[PDB]
């Protein structure tokens, strides 16, 4: 039962139900404000479709052509009738709001025959074609049947060959014309089947078309991208079709309460009079400052505002609002919370709460987490923008200073590596088709779109930038070029950014709002779990800490046997045939690895540094490059095949599992023994030199066995032990490992005996988990997300159910043999907000990740504390 | 009477009469903490004095002769005895904390004989002849005798010839001898009188030091430099001394309780084992971190910070204070707010806030305004400093990216132009005789000092950047030269910074903490004055617009005369000889002109701009070099000889007082005619095509009589009016005037009547008013400051008791007759933390100063607020 809902049944609670657009819809009619009546298709009744073949069920039709029959007695007119027509729009809605994505039918209910009855009744014959003309076009690109430039270039050769130039100046016999034009087209790019004239066969195509493509490869990658899952599904849609393109006095725009990319207070949107938003906003014909709207209708501007403001404060947040004016009279058709860049996400945030619409905790929970990446992209450097070359300016629909290669299709920018190749994605306009190429793009150059436009909409959305309505683009796909102020390009190096200039650039790194500390101070009052970093060496450290990291909780070892000056030291371990002689090689690098450590105490200022024990197996720093093979067979007093001999002595099968990290420490405790001493001769000589308390916390990585981890332990506490000798040094210190073997975690209580503190490497436990190594997946994992098997990347996203069960698993009997076992977690998860939350909820201590993900991590730490209180 | 009070006959609250270290003293002891009582000589006491002809008078000898009495009844000791004598400590301490400007006397009381039985009571001779020889020197300076090189060269050449390193390690016959080393410097360096043995007579000079010292050159200048009056003046405190310099387990040190460079939270000061700090400290022999103390002597450091904090939660801010340890004692010394940088200004600030030691209104009263300026020197640019040739590293005494030209005197440091040759002052270590030196250079650069070191306070205190402690640095003044690093300099330019690093560079511009928002955001929250901005340029008006400019308050439009592409039009108005063809000529700049009024319209979205018409005399555009004037005879088909005659025909004897502005404007309507065009033609057109409401204000300038303003504003109507043809334009716009001509303010009342708004020209109704043009007053100025005829530049800081009559006499006046009359200021004061403060108490309604000052203006209105309610 119940698959559909008039909008009078329901409000903002049932989102889930109704779908995004749907409560909005639904709670604008409860408030009591002009909108067209109308009924919501159910997400449910999605997935009844979906889970029923595919079909649309009986028990649905029947009750979306009962609400239909409901809006006829509604505003006395019938379903697409032949006289007196109604006409309605259809448009999905998903619980989550995907902007740029989604889909719209105007003028639904018109056909070869009830056109003309809308003809006489309206008596604007001119309209009514238009409104036909538009409404086919559509049917045929949503209900995907053909191409947009199919229908664009015919309007388009019939104006430019008819000495017109915009469509608003084609007579009602032009329309007439066209239309059959279009009918013509959408026939002759079908098998030939007829184009729908039965309303009812337009509108439950309509319906399938919405239903259907909520599995079509581009949204499956666009949830995945935004964190949305599969299960939920689309609503769908009907409202009484309302229209801004009567004339003279009729409109049709988009707008916002304040500026969605920066903060700013205020009305921000663009309009068109006469016209049809839905696609003639979102294109060519100039819109215009929708605060001019109040130079054209000073009427209707009066109640926009009184509208949009009350709309504002009735969610309490800004609202991204669609509005078309009917001959006099002001029509919304959509309200929602704006999808904001950083900046302005924080911005308005800090404004609501000082203008007293909000509570703290509220902006705190509203921002989108993962989004304050974008506050740290590198701005340009004013220096070499100044002697930039400007070649052309345009809107600066996203923010950012974006520069790379061009590449007029989103299939070859993206083939020319993600946001790793610097690639840069000029287009006409963008679409739906073009998601992974804005995305993998560091900016988007269009050249005609505005505000509302595609590219802005989905740019300021990705946190990407982007310059739109570009005009003096003119840009050839046959040859791949483009003619942009004073020269011509092929694929090579362009740059643009939010002073809306594109040119001919140096990036550099750069400040944080008082607006983002604002906020952050907010995150800080709020959350329990601390938030270390993942820092290797002294300015990243700095870095991070001047992020908020409160201390690290990775810093690798691996580079100080690496690094030139050192790895021939490493190297003669290896081939040493001799404990007292490795012993001594090993030595020889307890000054540098000293120094290393020094820097980072005298970096950290009290502040904790879990150091990990080396972690690769040796043949990863032996020569795999005879020419290097033959070098240390010199420096060795060797022979090439006997140093080969040792070097293929170490290859392993499988690097990621064998004598590596705790085994050689095992093996060679030597190893561990001598990076015992350099961190704790380090420690207590800055503890020495600068008086502030130092609590070095050593770290055993890959450790699968209680007994295993102590026999390590012993030879650190002993080495620790020993040199207390620049004084028995009060010094404390903990000797703890790493849960990233499954037994690790399987076997806790076990491990909490020895351990005094559990850090979860998330990275390798999901690898053991998962059982695929991340190095040799991607070849299959595309196939995963796009066979739908994979929402999420476990290796960038915390797989919960699975990963996440060894995790609270080790914390709980982590906990029972050691209850105050500290707990952390590291890699790339650490910095995710909803591993964040997780690990906050399941019993972490702290969290960490890279240097700039830190306020990325606190705002989440924030959150997820708020969230489950 | 009643010219010297104990410290337990006072508190806090009597600051102005026991000066600033009195209260805090004062304070400590009501408190109950372990501090050496004393008593104090109060602020009246040096007006006494001062108010005598500099002698001091007899009711206050006996006075300080009878405290000095309680004092020795105090401890059982006699002031100075031969046995056991009591030995005491002097130092002024004004009302307003004069940090490295102020002056100490340690171990006061002590001679030839009283040594000896400090010696044998004691029980540590080489203690008593040190204290002894420390004694003497100080005295030498303090009470200026003898300079301190004569001194030093003395130990060091005793030390640097008998194999020793350091005066600590000199025997207790070292030092015998030494003090008459000295004893013998301070005779043979005066006229040939005997050092002071009488300790009544060594006591009563000392007072005396300060008390003069309170009207010598440094003085005067620093006051004036950080806004102090000289009708205040200094006390004297007298303290029963205690000695960090007893040897192993005795000390003295500096400590701050929140780092005063960066807000840091959490302990920052050095010290000394065995010394005095008074000189050691702040010198040679590396101290040692404040927070290594606990290392030493960990029992001290218990209570040192257990006191410290109450001492900073009981004034609730931060805390500079001054400790001695006396063998196993600890010694409080000194307490005060602790002078800040504007980084650690604003965030000590926010930080007392959320640990709620104080309120909001408190830290917005809390900051010196002035100091904001800081936060606007541009930093370095990383690129630049990524390529910079780091030639040595030292303490990062004060903040900031300094850089220029280095000079090893003060005196020729400044001669080089102020912060205007980007010079930087180079030496061992610095002195209240250089602070004209320190305060007119990007950086400061010293050889020994450390953070109690004078450079460091004197150099945060001014907000410049400074580079102290680096030994390295072997300079040589007799051929003015330094060697640093790989490398020896030579009056060139040199570079550094708070990455504490000085080298071989490029300086941006840049961000703003979100303290300084959180600070900025309840600065907004609490002042009622607006704060507009002076800029005639969108990239300046962008610029303020982005520090909270509210509009904008003086746009000039000279350079729309002047500019290259506009001068020779003017100039041919000026040649033309019929109204005909100047109003031609004019004509023929509208259309620049224009575009320049659009681009600001466009910028100031909504916002105010106040438009001042043509200010300068026509003689100012005509060429005043025969090579550009007979270039301008082939412009115009002329000869030199009567462009020569035209110019030498504009030519005025004061340029400031003549056929200018207003006048301009009478004589050649036309003028004004055009820029009424150029203004309203632009307004409209933007508000045409952006629909964003816009209200023109025009300035009428130099006015003095309503007829006048009349007869020109009645100019502007009729043209502005007619240009209201692009429509009726229902726009509005308002006449006014600007309020910089003395008959201006006095015939306010009558002057309202035709002017809609007051704009007050400070500056030169300052000119008008002190009788004196800016530009040929300093040849006389300074003698004025010198002669302390002058506190303050009134050019930079509003005359109040004078133009101050003439600016609330215009607003009184002017709203007896025009109760709405909105009301300015301009120029400098705009800016000037005092001014903003009169202007928000007598009736002004907006402030306007140049873009980078605005964060000022908005604080100083915020305080402004706070403190007239």
Known sequence: ???????????????????????????????????????????????????????????????????????????????????????????????????????????????????????????????????????????????????????????????????????????????????????????????????????????????????????????????????????????????????????????????????????????????????????????????????????????????????????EKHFRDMQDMEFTIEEGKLYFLQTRNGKRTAPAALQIACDLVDEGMITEEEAVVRIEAKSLDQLLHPTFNPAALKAGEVIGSALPASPGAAAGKVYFTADEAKAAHEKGERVILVRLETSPEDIEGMHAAEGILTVRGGMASHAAVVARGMGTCCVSGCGEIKINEEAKTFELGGHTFAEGDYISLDGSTGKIIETQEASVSGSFERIMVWADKFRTLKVRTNADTPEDTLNAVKLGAEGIGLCRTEHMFFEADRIMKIRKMILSDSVEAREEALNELIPFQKGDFKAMYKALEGRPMTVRYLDPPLHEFVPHTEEEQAELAKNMGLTLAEVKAKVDELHEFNPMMGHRGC??????????????????????????????????????????????????????????????????????????????????????????????????????????????????????????????????????????????QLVEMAVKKGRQTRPGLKCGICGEHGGDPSSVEFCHKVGLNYVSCSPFRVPIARLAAAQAALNNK
């Open 663 to 804: 085994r050689l420490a095992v093996t060679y405790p030597e190893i561990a023994k001598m990076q015992t001493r350099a961190v704790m001769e380090a420690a207590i000589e800055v503890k020495e030199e600068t008086g502030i308390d130092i609590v070095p916390e050593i770290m055993i990585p890959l450790v699968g066995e209680k007994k295993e981890l102590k026999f390590v332990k012993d030879v650190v506490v002993e080495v620790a032990e020993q040199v207390k000798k620049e004084k028995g040094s009060d010094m404390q210190y903990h000797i703890g490992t790493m849960i990233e073997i499954p037994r690790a975690a399987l076997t806790a209580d076990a491990i909490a005996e020895e351990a005094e503190f559990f850090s979860f490497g998330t990275n390798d436990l999901t690898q053991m988990t998962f059982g695929f190594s991340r190095d040799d997946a991607g070849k299959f994992l595309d196939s995963y997300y796009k066979a739908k098997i994979y929402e999420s990347d476990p290796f960038a996203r915390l797989d919960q159910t699975g990963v996440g």
């Open 1 to 311: 039962a119940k698959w559909v809902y008039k909008f009078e049944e329901g409000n903002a609670s049932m989102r889930n139900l109704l779908g995004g657009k749907g409560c909005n819809l639904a709670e604008m009619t409860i408030l009591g404000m002009p909108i067209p009546q109308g009924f919501t298709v159910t997400t449910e009744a999605c997935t009844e479709y979906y889970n029923s073949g595919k079909q649309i069920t009986q028990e649905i039709q029947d009750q979306i052509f009962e609400a239909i029959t409901w809006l006829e007695e509604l505003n006395g007119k019938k379903f697409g009738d032949t006289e007196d027509p109604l006409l309605v729009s259809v448009r999905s809605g998903a619980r989550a709001s995907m902007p740029g994505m989604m889909d719209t039918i105007l003028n639904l209910g018109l056909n070869d025959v009830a056109v003309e009855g809308f003809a006489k009744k309206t008596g604007n014959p001119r309209f009514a074609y238009d409104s036909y003309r538009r409404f086919i076009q559509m049917y045929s690109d949503v209900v995907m049947e053909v191409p947009k430039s199919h229908f664009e270039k015919i309007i388009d050769a019939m104006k430019e060959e008819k000495g017109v130039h915009f469509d608003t100046d084609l007579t009602a016999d032009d329309l007439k014309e066209l239309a059959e034009k279009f009918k013509a087209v959408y026939k002759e790019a079908m098998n030939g089947e007829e184009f729908p004239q039965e309303p009812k066969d337009q509108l439950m195509g309509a319906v399938k078309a919405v239903f259907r493509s909520w599995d079509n490869p581009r949204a499956i990658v666009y949830r995945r991208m935004n964190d949305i899952p599969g299960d939920w599904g689309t609503a769908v849609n009907v409202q009484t079709m309302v229209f801004g393109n009567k004339g003279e006095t009729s409109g049709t725009g988009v707008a916002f309460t304040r500026n969605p990319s920066t903060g700013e207070k205020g009305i921000y949107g663009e309009y068109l009079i006469n016209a049809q938003g839905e696609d003639v906003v979102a294109g060519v014909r100039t819109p215009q400052p929708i605060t001019q709207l109040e130079n054209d209708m000073p009427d209707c501007y009066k109640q926009f505002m009184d509208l949009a403001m009350k709309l």
